[PDB]
Amino acid sequence: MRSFLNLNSIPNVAAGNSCSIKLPIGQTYEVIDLRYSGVTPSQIKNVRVELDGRLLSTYKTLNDLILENTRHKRKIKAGVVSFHFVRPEMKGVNVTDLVQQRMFALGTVGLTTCEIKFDIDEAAAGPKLSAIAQKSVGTAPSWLTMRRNFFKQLNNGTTEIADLPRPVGYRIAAIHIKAAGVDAVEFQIDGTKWRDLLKKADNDYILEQYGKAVLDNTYTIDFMLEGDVYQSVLLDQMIQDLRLKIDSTMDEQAEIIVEYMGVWSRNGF
């Protein structure tokens, strides 16, 4: 049996304020529903999920969490944005789908602090935020999704990005290139071309082919289209080159979103 709780009131919710959603340790957080009003998702900046003071996932703005959910075609409702720790799209290969999905839940056992920090923009009309938690029996943090932010310059022509962090033992579920002039992209590991120079229209067709929604000004490289976690990129301690070849038409700075995965460690990624 799961428990649906109305989280404690968020302290000091005001424009230009730096607030935090301190989660009580002991149980497992499958989903966290954040209700907002008097402020836009884009006005909720620097969203950071911290476990024991360390960064797990990061969102430039709350709007990126809305887009993250939209991509998987999850239920979107105005005035509310959810933190899906449990991945509903997961499919089991040697285990049940339910086990593969729940395996991403935010367990807090052994944790000292679990926080969701963020900054409220100064332009916020009259910010009002509350949270509800869908919890289950306590478990260690274990397998978690770690959304990381990276900024790189794209040229009009061909740009290559090979300096992406490769935490050993971790995996890569997907890579999202946020740019308005990306025509095609190619992904390779150690010379091996896992993703040919696929045109945007072709890449976007495959995405939609798997029930995903194409995000505006974004080139998504989904490594878990089938929902199989074993299809994701395994950051082998032996990989020599993890490269991305981007064919752009504009000269801009792209925001590269990398969805990492791995067993959370107090001294890990």
Partner 1 sequence: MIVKKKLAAGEFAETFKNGNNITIIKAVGELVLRAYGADGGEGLRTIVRQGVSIKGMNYTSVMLHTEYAQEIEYWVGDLDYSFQEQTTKSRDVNSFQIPLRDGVRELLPEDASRNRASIKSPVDIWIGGENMTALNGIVDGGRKFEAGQEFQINTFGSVNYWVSDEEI
Told to check if 148 binds partner 1 by CB under 8 A, we report: yes
CA-to-CA distance for 136 and 28, rounded, in angstroms?
A: 5
Residue closer to a copy of itself, measured from CB, 135 or 178:
135
Which residue type is seen at 222? D
CB 7 within 8 A of CB 116: no
Contacts of 265 (CB under 8 A, 6+ apart): none
Instruction: Give the residues across from 178 on adjacent strands.
Output: 218, 255
**C-beta pairs of 206-212 under 8 Å, 24+ apart in sequence:** 211/72, 211/73, 211/89, 212/71, 212/72, 212/73
CA angle (89, 94, 98) in 5-degree steps = 40
Residue closer to partner 1, measured from CB, 39 or 254:
254
Residue closer to a copy of itself, measured from CB, 137 or 180:
137
Residues in touch with a copy of itself (CB under 8 A):
1-6, 31, 33, 35, 74-75, 77, 80, 82, 91-94, 96-99, 132, 134, 193-198, 202-203, 205-206, 208-211, 223, 225-228, 231-234
Residue closer to Ca ion, measured from CB, 107 or 262:
107
Contact track, Ca ion, 89-128, x by CB under 5 A: ----------------x-x---------------------
Site for Ca ion in 142-161 (CB under 5 A): 142-143
142 contacts which partner out of Ca ion, partner 1, a copy of itself, none, CB within 5 to 8 A by kind? Ca ion
